[PDB]
Amino acid sequence: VALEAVRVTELAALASWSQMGRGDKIAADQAAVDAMRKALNEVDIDGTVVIGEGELDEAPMLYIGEKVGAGGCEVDIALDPLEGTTITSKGGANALTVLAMADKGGFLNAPDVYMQKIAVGGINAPKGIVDLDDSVTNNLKRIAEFKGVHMSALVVCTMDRPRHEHIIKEARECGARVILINDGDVSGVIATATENSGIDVYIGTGGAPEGVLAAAALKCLGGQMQARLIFNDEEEIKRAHRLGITDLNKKYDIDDLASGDIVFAATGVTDGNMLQGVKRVNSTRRGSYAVTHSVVMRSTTKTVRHITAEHSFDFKEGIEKFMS
Amino acid sequence: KVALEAVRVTELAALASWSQMGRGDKIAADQAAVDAMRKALNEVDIDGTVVIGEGELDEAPMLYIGEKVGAGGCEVDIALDPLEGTTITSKGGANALTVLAMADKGGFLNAPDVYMQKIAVGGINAPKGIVDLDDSVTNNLKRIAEFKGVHMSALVVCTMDRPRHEHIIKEARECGARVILINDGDVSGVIATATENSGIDVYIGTGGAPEGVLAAAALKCLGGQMQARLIFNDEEEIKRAHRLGITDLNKKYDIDDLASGDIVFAATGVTDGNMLQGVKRVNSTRRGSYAVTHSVVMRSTTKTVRHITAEHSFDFKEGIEKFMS
Amino acid sequence: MNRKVALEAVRVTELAALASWSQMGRGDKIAADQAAVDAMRKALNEVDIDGTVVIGEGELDEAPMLYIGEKVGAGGCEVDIALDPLEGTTITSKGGANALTVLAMADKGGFLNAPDVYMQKIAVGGINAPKGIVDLDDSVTNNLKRIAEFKGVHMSALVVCTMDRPRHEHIIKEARECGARVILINDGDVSGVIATATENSGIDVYIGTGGAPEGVLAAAALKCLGGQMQARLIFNDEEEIKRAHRLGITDLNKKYDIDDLASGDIVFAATGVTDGNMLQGVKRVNSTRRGSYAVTHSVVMRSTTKTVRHITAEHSFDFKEGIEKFMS
Amino acid sequence: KVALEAVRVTELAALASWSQMGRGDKIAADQAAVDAMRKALNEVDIDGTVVIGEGELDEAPMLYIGEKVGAGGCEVDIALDPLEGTTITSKGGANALTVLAMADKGGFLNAPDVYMQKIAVGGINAPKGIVDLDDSVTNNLKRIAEFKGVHMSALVVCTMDRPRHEHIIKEARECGARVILINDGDVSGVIATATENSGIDVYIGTGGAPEGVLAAAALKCLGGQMQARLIFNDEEEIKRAHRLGITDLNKKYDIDDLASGDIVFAATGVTDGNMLQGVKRVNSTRRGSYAVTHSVVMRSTTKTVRHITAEHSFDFKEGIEKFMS
Ligand SMILES: O=P(O)(O)OC[C@H]1O[C@](O)(CO)[C@@H](O)[C@@H]1O
Ligand SMILES: [Mn+2]
Ligand SMILES: [Mn+2]
Ligand SMILES: [Mn+2]
Ligand SMILES: [Mn+2]
Ligand SMILES: [Mn+2]
Ligand SMILES: [Mn+2]
């Protein structure tokens, strides 16, 4: 039941794209959530949303604990109908629609709080190539020697945020190159394991669900990632305690975020550093269509599929027919 | 419900066929693909009857006409070829494919395994009637060139390199058209007419009827026109055809008459062709060694077409024959 | 002019792009521009042209330059050469999108001689777009429905691109109120404008105000790809109108057609430094068949022959040394 | 240095050949390629001497051995094939190329047009002596399989489908290697060993000597090893080797012996093949209709490889024969 996930993320990405460049992040997310639930309920799984649009009193669709699917195997479901709602409204880089499946319990069940992350790709990388509590340069050195390149050849990716100034500055003292994304650290983490992405390491603090989703994909591509939750509120801490978290400062390896039999699928909404975005295409051959660029992958078989889909459409009509 | 899941079958049949590439052994090629395909197809959630396959249950033990396949689901008719181009693959020539098509019951033309005249052109907007087998090559190419908005000498016509086609090749060439020949693979050659950047505008030729119905099914999804006529040389062949309900022995079949209803079509390239790229061995830093497959899966109802590049893990320090069933 | 003058120009943009890339993500916009200028000036002096620079980089402290009037090659035809060693020094310094290295050539006089002022830009691609489809004096909504009708699509399918700058809030609001989609780039309106005529850029229209040398450079490409563009220089102060008058410009508010920006026999070459909406950026590749290399992606195109070439280059390098051994 | 402008010479040669693709007229294919490549070669700022071409003067009027070509520049030796695969192009088959290589004087084995034994493998790191014409096929492959880090059953060996290779095929298959056959074009077939994702690891075969030198000029830029040996069957064949200086008739040439020094290599694809995509007609509305060519150009000294996809405006309402002289 892996391949079907890609039509879910495909339809959600087409819905997001009808709202790209509209300046309305509410309407982009709403379009995506609508398309994702409609499509997800025609998938033969008994899915339980463990990461999604929020918890029930905030999100009427795709909330934590909602059961989804038409019936089938029992699966834990980690969604983000639109990763990059603000990116999409702006037309910026790195927006995605994401869907990951695991056996029940396979995903870290953590609140939607911030998370420190470090990640690197490679098939043959020892767990321990990256350590959150080590220095950037000692992390970069271990990585530069595993890859066989001078440290200054490494390209490090992080988000353009003040909280990242010390990472940016420390990696830059010993020669490494550090490129900045405005948003999209699901894409930024997975790029470390994506051919020709041009990114070797991702370092930074972003949302916790977004980190689990990326860890799911890195679990299928090969690579390492360590993560720590960060709490600001005291209801965040009570939220965590309720979920069974006793150690607020626990480090998580990539296996602690996503273990066992993982299916991951994603579709580009905009051009980013991992997937290409949805495009309008004309042709005399088949008329006009929207192209989507997707990836579905599986941790057991290590198989990765790259899917380019042609979806017929007549753009003489309003674009908002790509909403469901 | 089960469309994308069809690619995994043609992928496994193609890796199986590929391990037999250039081995000189057309039988081992065909057997590896049939085994991979039947193993993979029984593990798809359909209730499938094979209507086009490896043979009748007499001649072929596996994937025979009438065989039930699938793990359980909705009733579908199955049109398959585990390995289109067994000889191609044994030699590593162009255009070998593994093919799998599925329709509603009765969607596929039920014809005996006789020869079949084919003429195919691609284009979503091509009018039915743009090609006719009773009309001449020149007048067919004439209308096609007009429809495509090109001088007729820009048209590229594909046919097989066969003595039986010798007059096709000269007639098309008198009036300026370019005519290229493939050594085998008229499933790929017909489908190439509606494949982007194939470089092939028209297919004209005679070959197997199963191969004709499979190519018609892909063209019904990609948009295009095709006309076919069954060819009878024998009296058993004509008895054969009466019992399948055929009465007009030189009927001309349209695309709609070859494949109709809710068609899904899947193919994976075995060797490089004019429609799909073949299986290749790849090394990388990031994931080590894998085989890459290139596949296409498409659906007539939605007109959605998917191009799938798959990375299947493997260590080639072992033999290559560890991609079989 | 001749046939030597085309495909060799990509060698220039490729060496500048490699030098810029060794400075990608270092946070030093000065060092990046310096590497690009030095590499480009060294490679450009291996190109059989008696070139005169008519368009330089940006500022004299922002890096050195190939200055307006400098003479390069010195062994060939009387060529005006417009060039940007690193378009996107800030972009490159932080690894953002749309950074390019650009070289354009013309017959003497073929480029618009303007000062380095801002310029209003309106661009669309399509080789059948009739001059007149975009007019700066028309409203945004009225250019967009003129473009939607010529593209045979509903207005809400168009993608308008512009820079995330306050001076563009009005173009953004006015284009979104009648249904159009407006995407934003942080920088890079050479890439942004040329995008309108790059297959699968996803960009239908560019509308925005930016540097005038950038506009001419974009125009030289659009002239080669088929497209329309109209431009108007913009002047804030008198000490900067004087610059215009010194250069022969009398009508401060002239609208410039794409012919006026770039005319006659045009050659355009560009190489991507970072990934953008026109060109992929430089990447490190590992392989066993040829070891390690850096891959560049470039385009070179001619206005007289309409010929466009997309060039993927493999340059070997040992990534066991510093990355700083790509500078020149 | 004019090195990259080589590309447009092979591009024009290729557009002219393509206009004869699938016409069953190989002379007309060859002629169109010969004027197209001679006319545009004369715009290149070189002073070139054809050391390898489409004939001697008393056999070939144009691009004959020794002819002075160019418009003035650095003295250079010129190794041409205006169309590699004249019969291929005539029938639309795989692997037709146009080829142009430059070198400092004396850089190319000034070889007479005779048959040439060949064995070639790709890879920047292969030691000279990885392949040797006198070793057995099973011993060469074991060595290559070792160097490429795979089981010999994973290797893909290429060779022409010619009886003279009955025994190459059989011996290589007998210890498990995979052998794929091409109908023609052993320039593309040899270079393919070093082309990324070609699918071919080793070429072993006997074909024309000039085609061997052109290939080795490309392997010299991509990284590889190649042995060649001239073969003679006529006393007239041996006289041509004697006229051209050659004393040792059974010499084994190394790659450096076929091509040495500052080498530029340019090729454009005519038809799809195992090294380059062929010319295609394209219709967009953004730029109208065009022909797309696919070329590669490399230099021995810098090791830089450039892949070049070119768009050539053309009106296909007009006959296709404007892409000529
Ligand atoms: O000040 P910014 O935003 O870095 O823009 C610099 C650009 O302006 C110019 O100086 C003139 O447009 C350009 O050459 C340069 O690329
Ligand atoms: Mn989201
Ligand atoms: Mn979030
Ligand atoms: Mn078969
Ligand atoms: Mn058959
Ligand atoms: Mn600049
Ligand atoms: Mn020849």
Residue numbers in the entry:
A (entry chain D): 5 to 328
B (entry chain A), D (entry chain B): 4 to 328
C (entry chain C): 1 to 328
Would you copy out the relevant sentences from the publication that reported this structure?
Class II Fructose-1,6-bisphosphatases (FBPaseII) (EC: 3.1.3.11) are highly conserved essential enzymes in the gluconeogenic pathway of microorganisms. Class II fructose-1,6-bisphosphatase (FBPaseII, EC: 3.1.3.11) has been shown to be one of the key gluconeogenesis enzymes essential for the virulence of Francisella tularensis, a highly pathogenic Gram-negative coccobacillus species that causes tularemia in humans worldwide. F. tularensis FBPaseII (FtFBPaseII) is encoded by the glpX gene, and catalyzes the hydrolysis of F1,6BP to F6P and inorganic phosphate. In contrast, class II FBPases are arranged as an extended 14-stranded β-sheet (AAAA-BBBBBB-AAAA) composed of 4 strands, interrupted in the middle by a distinct β-sheet, (B, 6 strands) and followed by the continuation of the remaining four β-strands of sheet A on the other side.
Ft(Mn2+)FBPaseII-F6P complex (Form B)—Form B represents the most complex crystallographic structure of FtFBPaseII observed to date. The triclinic cell contained two approximate 222 (D2) tetramers separated by about 70 Å, with the orientation of their respective local dyads being slightly different. The most striking observation of this crystal form was the presence of two Mn2+ sites in chain D of the first tetramer in this crystal form (Form B). Interestingly, the structural data presented here characterizes the existence of a second (weaker) metal site (M2) that comprises essentially only two non-contiguous residues D116 and E214. Since the E214 residue is essentially at the same position (within experimental error), it is Asp116 that extends out significantly (distance E214-D116 OD1 2.8 Å). Consequently, the interaction of residue Tyr118 with the PO4(6) of the substrate is altered. Right the atomic rendering of the structure derived from the corresponding maps. This could represent the active conformation of the FtFBPaseII enzyme posed for a two-metal catalytic mechanism at high Mn2+ concentrations.
